[PDB]
Every structure is written in C-alpha cells, then in structure tokens.
Amino acid sequence: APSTGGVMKPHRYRP
Amino acid sequence: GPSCVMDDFRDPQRWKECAKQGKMPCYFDLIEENVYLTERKMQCECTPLSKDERAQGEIACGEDCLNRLLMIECSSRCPNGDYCSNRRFQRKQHADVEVILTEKKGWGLRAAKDLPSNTFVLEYCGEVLDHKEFKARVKEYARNKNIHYYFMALKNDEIIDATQKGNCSRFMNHSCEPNCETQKWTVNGQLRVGFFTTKLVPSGSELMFDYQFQRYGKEAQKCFCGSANCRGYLGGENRVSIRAAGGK
Ligand SMILES: C[S@@+](CC[C@H](N)C(=O)[O-])C[C@H]1O[C@@H](n2cnc3c(N)ncnc32)[C@H](O)[C@@H]1O
Ligand SMILES: [Zn+2]
Ligand SMILES: [Zn+2]
Ligand SMILES: [Zn+2]
C-alpha cells in the first residue's frame, strides 16, 4: 500500500 | 539558498562533507551512462565539410542531418568525423547548469548561462529496470518512506531508476508551465532519454519539465510550481495502478 510514488512519462512539449 | 556546480559531484569526500552541512544534496552513485540491472544491454548522408567550411563556422550534421532528424546520434564513423555536432549524448556536451536548493521541492537545476531554445541539457541516466525490478523498488522506496521519486518510463516495461545511481538530471523538478522536455534518442541502437530546453531559458532560471506523472501512491504530492495553469498535484486528479504506471 504505497502512500507515495509514481513514474515520470516522457512526452514532447506541444501546447 | 545553497548552490553547487556539476564538478562538485566528482569529489566523493568533499561532496560527503558538504552534504553533512546541507550545502550539497545527499550522496548518490554518479554514473555517465545507464547501467542495466540484468544483462540485456548507420551512417548519415551529410557531405563532409571541408577544412575551410569548418573555419567559416559551418556546422557539421546540423538541422538537415538525416540521423539528427530521426533523433539518432552519429557514431565515430560519421562522414564528418570529429566535426560531427550530432554526438552530444556520447560526448557529454551538457548545458551549463547548477544544482540549487529550492524552497519546497528539494534540490533543483538552474541555468548558469542563457540557454537557447532546443538545447541539450543532460541525459536522464540511471539503473534500467524490468517490470519485476520496478515492482521490487516500488515496495522498497515505499518501505523507506522516500519523499522523492526518480522513475522515468523508457520503453514498454523498462524504467530508468535514478534513485541510487544517476547524474544531475535526477534534480530536475516538475512544472505545469515547463521550459524543458524529454526526447528519446538512439545511441548505438540503444534508447536514451535526454532533457532539452523548450524555449530561451534566461540565466538563473530553474529548469523544469512536465513530468506527466503517473501516480500509483494513495496520497498525491502537492505541486509547488506556482504556474497560473498549475494542476495542483504531481500526477493530476486520477491515481493509476502500479502495473499501468510501470508501462503495461
Ligand atoms: C526527480 S526528483 C527531483 C529532484 C528532487 N527535488 C530532489 O531534491 O532530489 C522528483 C521529486 O521532487 C519533488 N518535486 C519535483 N517537482 C515538484 C513540484 N513541482 N512540486 C512539488 N514537489 C516537486 C517531489 O518530491 C518529486 O518526487
Ligand atoms: Zn549528418
Ligand atoms: Zn554526424
Ligand atoms: Zn504545478
């Protein structure tokens, strides 16, 4: 039950 | 706030003394290229520049290089040899940046000179994990009560983890109005992630990317970017599963 954590996802800047 | 230059991390004992005094970030294993946790680790068509063209300031393998247009770096066998300006990752042709302590995000990266738009900052290096490795680290980092997360999706189930081993790219914070972006480049048939400026970043400005964070944790981290369009949290409104965040 991780209270914190995640994965950064690569993407090109568009807006 | 304290600041340190990239060359301060090349001295383990000075760095460890600075880190006891809060003058540098906590120690991490400094690496120059990705290391694969388990053993699982093309000429362009540019006409060679003459010696006189090089003296005139002409660029070798510039905007019209077929390798550069496909986000592929040239090798030592490039028709432009030593002149090749398309080997930034291999040659470590980093932007001039400093590691700075921010008010509430931990350490961060700042421009030490004005950085033009589309400038290579640094490669996001780390330990490349498979999904089994990613899950074992998810459990450990949750067990240790780590604040900072350093997992970057690379391809399919593969993740670059800069928690224990990496370089100064692991200091780049998130912004909802970013001035950097990731780009996936191929070097020797291997995929690598680098940070590139998205605009003219004036000297002294913090460098940040839009993490587009896939949060698996129960509690969302508040975002302190301060932008007008701030999403409020790293990871937005919805929580994703450990399997989905990990690229499956
Ligand atoms: C890849 S690390 C960046 C370097 C980190 N600040 C450090 O001190 O090592 C990402 C972590 O920095 C913090 N962080 C980055 N950007 C943030 C932001 N806009 N608001 C709040 N925390 C942020 C969070 O703890 C996040 O998990
Ligand atoms: Zn070329
Ligand atoms: Zn080249
Ligand atoms: Zn924000």
PDB file of C-alpha atoms and ligand atoms in Angstrom:
ATOM      1  CA  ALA A   1       0.000   0.000   0.000  1.00  0.00           C
ATOM      2  CA  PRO A   2       2.432   2.731  -1.144  1.00  0.00           C
ATOM      3  CA  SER A   3       1.259   6.054   0.292  1.00  0.00           C
ATOM      4  CA  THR A   4       3.547   7.940  -2.213  1.00  0.00           C
ATOM      5  CA  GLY A   5       5.169   7.196  -5.572  1.00  0.00           C
ATOM      6  CA  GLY A   6       4.842   7.258  -9.325  1.00  0.00           C
ATOM      7  CA  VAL A   7       6.579   7.195 -12.742  1.00  0.00           C
ATOM      8  CA  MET A   8       7.534  10.169 -14.912  1.00  0.00           C
ATOM      9  CA  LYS A   9       6.379   9.758 -18.507  1.00  0.00           C
ATOM     10  CA  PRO A  10       8.371  11.146 -21.490  1.00  0.00           C
ATOM     11  CA  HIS A  11       6.362  13.273 -23.949  1.00  0.00           C
ATOM     12  CA  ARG A  12       7.088  16.079 -26.423  1.00  0.00           C
ATOM     13  CA  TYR A  13       6.024  19.645 -25.479  1.00  0.00           C
ATOM     14  CA  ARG A  14       3.049  20.684 -27.669  1.00  0.00           C
ATOM     15  CA  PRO A  15       0.613  23.252 -26.147  1.00  0.00           C
TER      16      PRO A  15
ATOM     17  CA  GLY B   1      19.880  29.145  -0.916  1.00  0.00           C
ATOM     18  CA  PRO B   2      22.885  26.852  -1.479  1.00  0.00           C
ATOM     19  CA  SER B   3      24.156  26.062  -4.973  1.00  0.00           C
ATOM     20  CA  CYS B   4      26.773  23.703  -6.315  1.00  0.00           C
ATOM     21  CA  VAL B   5      28.359  23.206  -9.744  1.00  0.00           C
ATOM     22  CA  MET B   6      28.274  19.887 -11.645  1.00  0.00           C
ATOM     23  CA  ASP B   7      32.051  19.378 -10.948  1.00  0.00           C
ATOM     24  CA  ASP B   8      31.379  19.258  -7.165  1.00  0.00           C
ATOM     25  CA  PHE B   9      29.802  15.769  -7.595  1.00  0.00           C
ATOM     26  CA  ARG B  10      33.155  14.418  -8.997  1.00  0.00           C
ATOM     27  CA  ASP B  11      34.740  14.553  -5.488  1.00  0.00           C
ATOM     28  CA  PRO B  12      33.070  11.958  -3.220  1.00  0.00           C
ATOM     29  CA  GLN B  13      34.775  13.024   0.040  1.00  0.00           C
ATOM     30  CA  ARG B  14      34.271  16.820  -0.484  1.00  0.00           C
ATOM     31  CA  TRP B  15      30.628  16.150  -1.527  1.00  0.00           C
ATOM     32  CA  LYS B  16      30.038  13.951   1.562  1.00  0.00           C
ATOM     33  CA  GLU B  17      31.372  16.742   3.828  1.00  0.00           C
ATOM     34  CA  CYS B  18      29.210  19.386   2.064  1.00  0.00           C
ATOM     35  CA  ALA B  19      26.134  17.036   2.370  1.00  0.00           C
ATOM     36  CA  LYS B  20      26.532  16.669   6.190  1.00  0.00           C
ATOM     37  CA  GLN B  21      26.344  20.511   6.346  1.00  0.00           C
ATOM     38  CA  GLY B  22      23.335  20.771   3.941  1.00  0.00           C
ATOM     39  CA  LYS B  23      25.481  22.516   1.283  1.00  0.00           C
ATOM     40  CA  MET B  24      25.001  19.807  -1.377  1.00  0.00           C
ATOM     41  CA  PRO B  25      22.308  17.164  -1.973  1.00  0.00           C
ATOM     42  CA  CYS B  26      22.582  13.713  -0.310  1.00  0.00           C
ATOM     43  CA  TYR B  27      25.095  11.258  -1.839  1.00  0.00           C
ATOM     44  CA  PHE B  28      24.131   9.170  -4.906  1.00  0.00           C
ATOM     45  CA  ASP B  29      26.288   6.955  -7.189  1.00  0.00           C
ATOM     46  CA  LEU B  30      27.365   9.171 -10.095  1.00  0.00           C
ATOM     47  CA  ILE B  31      27.173   7.405 -13.481  1.00  0.00           C
ATOM     48  CA  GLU B  32      27.945   8.620 -17.075  1.00  0.00           C
ATOM     49  CA  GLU B  33      25.661   6.095 -18.871  1.00  0.00           C
ATOM     50  CA  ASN B  34      22.734   3.795 -17.987  1.00  0.00           C
ATOM     51  CA  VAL B  35      23.534   0.520 -16.230  1.00  0.00           C
ATOM     52  CA  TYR B  36      21.170  -2.448 -16.921  1.00  0.00           C
ATOM     53  CA  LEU B  37      20.204  -4.259 -13.655  1.00  0.00           C
ATOM     54  CA  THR B  38      20.034  -7.535 -15.586  1.00  0.00           C
ATOM     55  CA  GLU B  39      22.215  -8.418 -18.593  1.00  0.00           C
ATOM     56  CA  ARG B  40      20.105  -7.172 -21.554  1.00  0.00           C
ATOM     57  CA  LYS B  41      22.278  -4.248 -22.829  1.00  0.00           C
ATOM     58  CA  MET B  42      24.295   3.548 -39.543  1.00  0.00           C
ATOM     59  CA  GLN B  43      25.991   6.434 -41.451  1.00  0.00           C
ATOM     60  CA  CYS B  44      24.011   9.624 -42.198  1.00  0.00           C
ATOM     61  CA  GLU B  45      24.194  11.344 -45.664  1.00  0.00           C
ATOM     62  CA  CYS B  46      25.830  14.671 -44.868  1.00  0.00           C
ATOM     63  CA  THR B  47      28.523  15.729 -47.290  1.00  0.00           C
ATOM     64  CA  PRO B  48      31.721  16.220 -45.276  1.00  0.00           C
ATOM     65  CA  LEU B  49      32.613  19.828 -44.509  1.00  0.00           C
ATOM     66  CA  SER B  50      35.991  20.923 -45.906  1.00  0.00           C
ATOM     67  CA  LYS B  51      38.629  22.461 -43.560  1.00  0.00           C
ATOM     68  CA  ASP B  52      37.705  25.981 -44.835  1.00  0.00           C
ATOM     69  CA  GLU B  53      33.952  25.396 -44.252  1.00  0.00           C
ATOM     70  CA  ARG B  54      34.784  24.445 -40.623  1.00  0.00           C
ATOM     71  CA  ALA B  55      36.846  27.702 -40.293  1.00  0.00           C
ATOM     72  CA  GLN B  56      33.858  29.727 -41.678  1.00  0.00           C
ATOM     73  CA  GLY B  57      31.640  28.476 -38.836  1.00  0.00           C
ATOM     74  CA  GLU B  58      29.671  25.931 -40.918  1.00  0.00           C
ATOM     75  CA  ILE B  59      28.012  23.264 -38.732  1.00  0.00           C
ATOM     76  CA  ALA B  60      28.564  19.536 -39.304  1.00  0.00           C
ATOM     77  CA  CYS B  61      25.449  17.264 -39.071  1.00  0.00           C
ATOM     78  CA  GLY B  62      23.212  20.214 -38.210  1.00  0.00           C
ATOM     79  CA  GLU B  63      19.438  20.735 -38.735  1.00  0.00           C
ATOM     80  CA  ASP B  64      19.408  18.839 -42.099  1.00  0.00           C
ATOM     81  CA  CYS B  65      21.293  15.688 -40.843  1.00  0.00           C
ATOM     82  CA  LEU B  66      19.215  12.536 -41.549  1.00  0.00           C
ATOM     83  CA  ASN B  67      20.420  10.971 -38.246  1.00  0.00           C
ATOM     84  CA  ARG B  68      19.561  14.131 -36.226  1.00  0.00           C
ATOM     85  CA  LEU B  69      16.065  14.397 -37.833  1.00  0.00           C
ATOM     86  CA  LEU B  70      15.310  10.821 -36.607  1.00  0.00           C
ATOM     87  CA  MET B  71      16.767  11.536 -33.122  1.00  0.00           C
ATOM     88  CA  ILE B  72      19.681   9.159 -33.796  1.00  0.00           C
ATOM     89  CA  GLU B  73      23.236  10.195 -32.880  1.00  0.00           C
ATOM     90  CA  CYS B  74      26.146   9.707 -35.278  1.00  0.00           C
ATOM     91  CA  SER B  75      28.958   7.318 -34.445  1.00  0.00           C
ATOM     92  CA  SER B  76      32.754   7.787 -34.708  1.00  0.00           C
ATOM     93  CA  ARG B  77      32.320   6.635 -38.387  1.00  0.00           C
ATOM     94  CA  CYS B  78      30.273   9.747 -39.313  1.00  0.00           C
ATOM     95  CA  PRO B  79      31.301  11.298 -42.700  1.00  0.00           C
ATOM     96  CA  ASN B  80      32.034  14.472 -40.656  1.00  0.00           C
ATOM     97  CA  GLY B  81      34.295  12.563 -38.183  1.00  0.00           C
ATOM     98  CA  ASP B  82      35.454  14.772 -35.312  1.00  0.00           C
ATOM     99  CA  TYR B  83      33.439  17.761 -36.602  1.00  0.00           C
ATOM    100  CA  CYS B  84      30.101  15.979 -36.018  1.00  0.00           C
ATOM    101  CA  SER B  85      27.855  18.122 -33.852  1.00  0.00           C
ATOM    102  CA  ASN B  86      25.345  15.135 -33.532  1.00  0.00           C
ATOM    103  CA  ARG B  87      27.123  13.165 -30.710  1.00  0.00           C
ATOM    104  CA  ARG B  88      26.022  15.364 -27.701  1.00  0.00           C
ATOM    105  CA  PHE B  89      24.964  12.378 -25.524  1.00  0.00           C
ATOM    106  CA  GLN B  90      28.199  10.420 -26.248  1.00  0.00           C
ATOM    107  CA  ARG B  91      30.469  13.454 -25.771  1.00  0.00           C
ATOM    108  CA  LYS B  92      28.543  14.691 -22.657  1.00  0.00           C
ATOM    109  CA  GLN B  93      28.035  18.142 -24.277  1.00  0.00           C
ATOM    110  CA  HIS B  94      25.865  19.329 -21.367  1.00  0.00           C
ATOM    111  CA  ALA B  95      24.256  22.791 -20.821  1.00  0.00           C
ATOM    112  CA  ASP B  96      25.898  24.946 -18.155  1.00  0.00           C
ATOM    113  CA  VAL B  97      23.691  24.173 -15.119  1.00  0.00           C
ATOM    114  CA  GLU B  98      23.830  24.392 -11.310  1.00  0.00           C
ATOM    115  CA  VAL B  99      22.194  22.251  -8.595  1.00  0.00           C
ATOM    116  CA  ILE B 100      20.256  24.577  -6.251  1.00  0.00           C
ATOM    117  CA  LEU B 101      18.169  24.079  -3.077  1.00  0.00           C
ATOM    118  CA  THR B 102      14.553  25.200  -3.707  1.00  0.00           C
ATOM    119  CA  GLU B 103      12.059  26.467  -1.088  1.00  0.00           C
ATOM    120  CA  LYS B 104       9.793  23.337  -1.040  1.00  0.00           C
ATOM    121  CA  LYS B 105      10.649  20.900  -3.857  1.00  0.00           C
ATOM    122  CA  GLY B 106      14.087  19.754  -2.573  1.00  0.00           C
ATOM    123  CA  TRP B 107      17.129  20.321  -4.804  1.00  0.00           C
ATOM    124  CA  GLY B 108      16.640  21.509  -8.422  1.00  0.00           C
ATOM    125  CA  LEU B 109      18.529  22.542 -11.557  1.00  0.00           C
ATOM    126  CA  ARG B 110      19.147  26.101 -12.779  1.00  0.00           C
ATOM    127  CA  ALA B 111      20.644  27.637 -15.927  1.00  0.00           C
ATOM    128  CA  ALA B 112      24.105  29.118 -15.206  1.00  0.00           C
ATOM    129  CA  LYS B 113      24.040  30.868 -18.676  1.00  0.00           C
ATOM    130  CA  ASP B 114      21.147  31.831 -21.043  1.00  0.00           C
ATOM    131  CA  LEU B 115      20.102  28.590 -22.801  1.00  0.00           C
ATOM    132  CA  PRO B 116      18.711  28.915 -26.335  1.00  0.00           C
ATOM    133  CA  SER B 117      15.533  27.033 -27.373  1.00  0.00           C
ATOM    134  CA  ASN B 118      16.147  23.318 -28.172  1.00  0.00           C
ATOM    135  CA  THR B 119      19.382  22.993 -26.153  1.00  0.00           C
ATOM    136  CA  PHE B 120      20.518  19.593 -24.782  1.00  0.00           C
ATOM    137  CA  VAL B 121      20.659  19.934 -21.006  1.00  0.00           C
ATOM    138  CA  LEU B 122      21.674  16.417 -19.738  1.00  0.00           C
ATOM    139  CA  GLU B 123      20.876  12.716 -20.253  1.00  0.00           C
ATOM    140  CA  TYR B 124      18.482  11.185 -17.695  1.00  0.00           C
ATOM    141  CA  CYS B 125      20.795   8.340 -16.548  1.00  0.00           C
ATOM    142  CA  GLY B 126      20.094   5.551 -14.083  1.00  0.00           C
ATOM    143  CA  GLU B 127      19.621   1.849 -13.436  1.00  0.00           C
ATOM    144  CA  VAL B 128      17.432   0.401 -16.150  1.00  0.00           C
ATOM    145  CA  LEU B 129      14.907  -1.950 -14.548  1.00  0.00           C
ATOM    146  CA  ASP B 130      12.470  -4.515 -15.981  1.00  0.00           C
ATOM    147  CA  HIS B 131       8.856  -4.718 -14.572  1.00  0.00           C
ATOM    148  CA  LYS B 132       9.941  -7.261 -11.911  1.00  0.00           C
ATOM    149  CA  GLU B 133      12.757  -4.888 -10.759  1.00  0.00           C
ATOM    150  CA  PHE B 134      10.444  -1.830 -10.950  1.00  0.00           C
ATOM    151  CA  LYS B 135       7.936  -3.574  -8.596  1.00  0.00           C
ATOM    152  CA  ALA B 136      10.666  -4.625  -6.095  1.00  0.00           C
ATOM    153  CA  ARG B 137      11.845  -0.941  -5.992  1.00  0.00           C
ATOM    154  CA  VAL B 138       8.232   0.330  -5.654  1.00  0.00           C
ATOM    155  CA  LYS B 139       7.938  -1.753  -2.453  1.00  0.00           C
ATOM    156  CA  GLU B 140      11.368  -0.674  -1.085  1.00  0.00           C
ATOM    157  CA  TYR B 141      11.015   3.070  -1.715  1.00  0.00           C
ATOM    158  CA  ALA B 142       7.520   2.894  -0.045  1.00  0.00           C
ATOM    159  CA  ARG B 143       9.059   0.952   2.916  1.00  0.00           C
ATOM    160  CA  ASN B 144      11.847   3.534   3.345  1.00  0.00           C
ATOM    161  CA  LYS B 145       9.363   6.448   3.316  1.00  0.00           C
ATOM    162  CA  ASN B 146      11.260   8.182   0.464  1.00  0.00           C
ATOM    163  CA  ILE B 147       9.941  11.643  -0.428  1.00  0.00           C
ATOM    164  CA  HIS B 148      11.495  11.924  -3.914  1.00  0.00           C
ATOM    165  CA  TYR B 149      10.722   9.650  -6.786  1.00  0.00           C
ATOM    166  CA  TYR B 150      13.187   9.039  -9.679  1.00  0.00           C
ATOM    167  CA  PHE B 151      11.478   6.542 -12.098  1.00  0.00           C
ATOM    168  CA  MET B 152      11.340   7.588 -15.767  1.00  0.00           C
ATOM    169  CA  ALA B 153       9.456   5.411 -18.346  1.00  0.00           C
ATOM    170  CA  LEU B 154      11.929   4.497 -21.168  1.00  0.00           C
ATOM    171  CA  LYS B 155      10.167   1.839 -23.341  1.00  0.00           C
ATOM    172  CA  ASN B 156       7.418  -0.858 -22.925  1.00  0.00           C
ATOM    173  CA  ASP B 157       8.104  -2.369 -19.325  1.00  0.00           C
ATOM    174  CA  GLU B 158      11.606  -0.714 -18.898  1.00  0.00           C
ATOM    175  CA  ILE B 159      12.151   2.148 -16.443  1.00  0.00           C
ATOM    176  CA  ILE B 160      15.186   4.286 -15.755  1.00  0.00           C
ATOM    177  CA  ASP B 161      15.594   4.499 -11.949  1.00  0.00           C
ATOM    178  CA  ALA B 162      17.913   7.376 -10.816  1.00  0.00           C
ATOM    179  CA  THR B 163      17.250   6.921  -7.051  1.00  0.00           C
ATOM    180  CA  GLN B 164      20.554   5.240  -6.164  1.00  0.00           C
ATOM    181  CA  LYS B 165      22.617   5.759  -9.364  1.00  0.00           C
ATOM    182  CA  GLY B 166      22.325   8.605 -11.828  1.00  0.00           C
ATOM    183  CA  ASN B 167      23.621  12.049 -12.692  1.00  0.00           C
ATOM    184  CA  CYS B 168      22.469  15.700 -12.100  1.00  0.00           C
ATOM    185  CA  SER B 169      19.447  15.268 -14.425  1.00  0.00           C
ATOM    186  CA  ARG B 170      17.805  13.468 -11.376  1.00  0.00           C
ATOM    187  CA  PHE B 171      17.439  17.014  -9.832  1.00  0.00           C
ATOM    188  CA  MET B 172      15.116  18.436 -12.483  1.00  0.00           C
ATOM    189  CA  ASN B 173      11.760  19.380 -10.850  1.00  0.00           C
ATOM    190  CA  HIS B 174       8.274  19.394 -12.387  1.00  0.00           C
ATOM    191  CA  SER B 175       6.491  22.461 -13.740  1.00  0.00           C
ATOM    192  CA  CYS B 176       2.959  22.735 -15.185  1.00  0.00           C
ATOM    193  CA  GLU B 177       4.433  25.545 -17.449  1.00  0.00           C
ATOM    194  CA  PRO B 178       7.710  23.728 -18.278  1.00  0.00           C
ATOM    195  CA  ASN B 179      10.780  25.154 -20.008  1.00  0.00           C
ATOM    196  CA  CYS B 180      12.302  21.642 -20.837  1.00  0.00           C
ATOM    197  CA  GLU B 181      11.064  18.392 -22.361  1.00  0.00           C
ATOM    198  CA  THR B 182      12.290  14.813 -22.643  1.00  0.00           C
ATOM    199  CA  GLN B 183      13.466  13.486 -26.056  1.00  0.00           C
ATOM    200  CA  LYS B 184      14.174   9.794 -26.709  1.00  0.00           C
ATOM    201  CA  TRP B 185      17.402   9.431 -28.665  1.00  0.00           C
ATOM    202  CA  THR B 186      19.088   6.310 -30.110  1.00  0.00           C
ATOM    203  CA  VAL B 187      22.843   5.960 -29.398  1.00  0.00           C
ATOM    204  CA  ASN B 188      24.404   2.711 -30.692  1.00  0.00           C
ATOM    205  CA  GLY B 189      20.969   1.184 -31.271  1.00  0.00           C
ATOM    206  CA  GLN B 190      20.106   1.829 -27.581  1.00  0.00           C
ATOM    207  CA  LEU B 191      17.317   4.146 -26.458  1.00  0.00           C
ATOM    208  CA  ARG B 192      18.251   7.009 -24.089  1.00  0.00           C
ATOM    209  CA  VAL B 193      16.254   9.886 -22.606  1.00  0.00           C
ATOM    210  CA  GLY B 194      17.606  13.420 -22.536  1.00  0.00           C
ATOM    211  CA  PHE B 195      16.262  16.815 -21.317  1.00  0.00           C
ATOM    212  CA  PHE B 196      16.101  19.661 -23.896  1.00  0.00           C
ATOM    213  CA  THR B 197      15.046  23.309 -23.440  1.00  0.00           C
ATOM    214  CA  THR B 198      11.701  24.119 -24.972  1.00  0.00           C
ATOM    215  CA  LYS B 199      12.337  27.964 -25.025  1.00  0.00           C
ATOM    216  CA  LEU B 200      15.100  30.582 -24.414  1.00  0.00           C
ATOM    217  CA  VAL B 201      15.745  29.938 -20.693  1.00  0.00           C
ATOM    218  CA  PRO B 202      17.348  33.019 -19.154  1.00  0.00           C
ATOM    219  CA  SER B 203      20.412  32.598 -16.878  1.00  0.00           C
ATOM    220  CA  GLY B 204      19.420  31.885 -13.274  1.00  0.00           C
ATOM    221  CA  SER B 205      16.043  30.377 -14.221  1.00  0.00           C
ATOM    222  CA  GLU B 206      15.090  26.987 -12.856  1.00  0.00           C
ATOM    223  CA  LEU B 207      14.895  24.172 -15.417  1.00  0.00           C
ATOM    224  CA  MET B 208      11.770  22.044 -15.197  1.00  0.00           C
ATOM    225  CA  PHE B 209       9.833  19.510 -17.260  1.00  0.00           C
ATOM    226  CA  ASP B 210       6.203  18.435 -17.215  1.00  0.00           C
ATOM    227  CA  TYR B 211       6.584  15.043 -15.525  1.00  0.00           C
ATOM    228  CA  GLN B 212       3.175  13.902 -16.925  1.00  0.00           C
ATOM    229  CA  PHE B 213       3.385  11.809 -13.729  1.00  0.00           C
ATOM    230  CA  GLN B 214       1.507   8.514 -13.432  1.00  0.00           C
ATOM    231  CA  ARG B 215       0.911   8.330  -9.702  1.00  0.00           C
ATOM    232  CA  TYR B 216       0.357   4.908  -8.113  1.00  0.00           C
ATOM    233  CA  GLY B 217       0.525   6.122  -4.479  1.00  0.00           C
ATOM    234  CA  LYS B 218      -2.539   6.678  -2.258  1.00  0.00           C
ATOM    235  CA  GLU B 219      -1.631  10.345  -1.497  1.00  0.00           C
ATOM    236  CA  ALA B 220      -0.981  12.898  -4.221  1.00  0.00           C
ATOM    237  CA  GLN B 221       2.088  15.152  -3.847  1.00  0.00           C
ATOM    238  CA  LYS B 222       1.057  18.871  -3.940  1.00  0.00           C
ATOM    239  CA  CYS B 223       2.657  20.771  -6.827  1.00  0.00           C
ATOM    240  CA  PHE B 224       4.631  23.867  -5.884  1.00  0.00           C
ATOM    241  CA  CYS B 225       5.435  25.069  -9.478  1.00  0.00           C
ATOM    242  CA  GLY B 226       3.366  28.223  -8.954  1.00  0.00           C
ATOM    243  CA  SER B 227       2.104  28.441 -12.540  1.00  0.00           C
ATOM    244  CA  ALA B 228      -1.249  30.019 -13.481  1.00  0.00           C
ATOM    245  CA  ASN B 229      -2.298  26.667 -15.040  1.00  0.00           C
ATOM    246  CA  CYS B 230      -0.990  24.521 -12.097  1.00  0.00           C
ATOM    247  CA  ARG B 231      -2.676  21.118 -11.894  1.00  0.00           C
ATOM    248  CA  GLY B 232      -2.382  21.147  -8.062  1.00  0.00           C
ATOM    249  CA  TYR B 233      -0.706  17.747  -7.759  1.00  0.00           C
ATOM    250  CA  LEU B 234       2.080  15.773  -9.418  1.00  0.00           C
ATOM    251  CA  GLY B 235       0.036  13.151 -11.228  1.00  0.00           C
ATOM    252  CA  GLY B 236      -3.192  15.139 -11.727  1.00  0.00           C
ATOM    253  CA  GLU B 237      -6.633  14.006 -10.465  1.00  0.00           C
ATOM    254  CA  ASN B 238      -6.593  10.230 -11.017  1.00  0.00           C
ATOM    255  CA  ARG B 239      -4.493   7.504  -9.395  1.00  0.00           C
ATOM    256  CA  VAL B 240      -3.203   4.746 -11.723  1.00  0.00           C
ATOM    257  CA  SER B 241      -2.177   1.150 -10.856  1.00  0.00           C
ATOM    258  CA  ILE B 242       1.448   0.031 -10.257  1.00  0.00           C
ATOM    259  CA  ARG B 243       1.122  -2.080 -13.459  1.00  0.00           C
ATOM    260  CA  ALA B 244      -0.163   0.878 -15.571  1.00  0.00           C
ATOM    261  CA  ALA B 245       2.382   3.458 -14.172  1.00  0.00           C
ATOM    262  CA  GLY B 246       5.125   0.893 -14.984  1.00  0.00           C
ATOM    263  CA  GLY B 247       4.172   0.877 -18.693  1.00  0.00           C
ATOM    264  CA  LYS B 248       1.984  -2.231 -19.056  1.00  0.00           C
TER     265      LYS B 248
HETATM  266  C1  LIG C   1      13.193  13.543  -9.841  1.00  0.00           C
HETATM  267  S1  LIG C   1      13.101  14.215  -8.175  1.00  0.00           S
HETATM  268  C2  LIG C   1      13.689  15.909  -8.496  1.00  0.00           C
HETATM  269  C3  LIG C   1      14.803  16.302  -7.538  1.00  0.00           C
HETATM  270  C4  LIG C   1      14.325  16.386  -6.093  1.00  0.00           C
HETATM  271  N1  LIG C   1      13.698  17.715  -5.863  1.00  0.00           N
HETATM  272  C5  LIG C   1      15.475  16.196  -5.093  1.00  0.00           C
HETATM  273  O1  LIG C   1      15.565  17.046  -4.160  1.00  0.00           O
HETATM  274  O2  LIG C   1      16.238  15.212  -5.269  1.00  0.00           O
HETATM  275  C6  LIG C   1      11.265  14.450  -8.081  1.00  0.00           C
HETATM  276  C7  LIG C   1      10.792  14.792  -6.689  1.00  0.00           C
HETATM  277  O3  LIG C   1      10.974  16.206  -6.464  1.00  0.00           O
HETATM  278  C8  LIG C   1       9.845  16.772  -5.823  1.00  0.00           C
HETATM  279  N2  LIG C   1       9.231  17.716  -6.759  1.00  0.00           N
HETATM  280  C9  LIG C   1       9.623  17.972  -8.048  1.00  0.00           C
HETATM  281  N3  LIG C   1       8.905  18.890  -8.655  1.00  0.00           N
HETATM  282  C10 LIG C   1       7.969  19.260  -7.699  1.00  0.00           C
HETATM  283  C11 LIG C   1       6.926  20.213  -7.705  1.00  0.00           C
HETATM  284  N4  LIG C   1       6.621  20.996  -8.753  1.00  0.00           N
HETATM  285  N5  LIG C   1       6.197  20.351  -6.569  1.00  0.00           N
HETATM  286  C12 LIG C   1       6.495  19.583  -5.513  1.00  0.00           C
HETATM  287  N6  LIG C   1       7.456  18.659  -5.389  1.00  0.00           N
HETATM  288  C13 LIG C   1       8.160  18.544  -6.523  1.00  0.00           C
HETATM  289  C14 LIG C   1       8.945  15.592  -5.419  1.00  0.00           C
HETATM  290  O4  LIG C   1       9.260  15.055  -4.136  1.00  0.00           O
HETATM  291  C15 LIG C   1       9.294  14.579  -6.515  1.00  0.00           C
HETATM  292  O5  LIG C   1       9.053  13.218  -6.188  1.00  0.00           O
HETATM  293 ZN    ZN C   2      24.851  14.033 -40.709  1.00  0.00          ZN
HETATM  294 ZN    ZN C   3      27.361  13.178 -37.870  1.00  0.00          ZN
HETATM  295 ZN    ZN C   4       2.041  22.811 -10.859  1.00  0.00          ZN
END
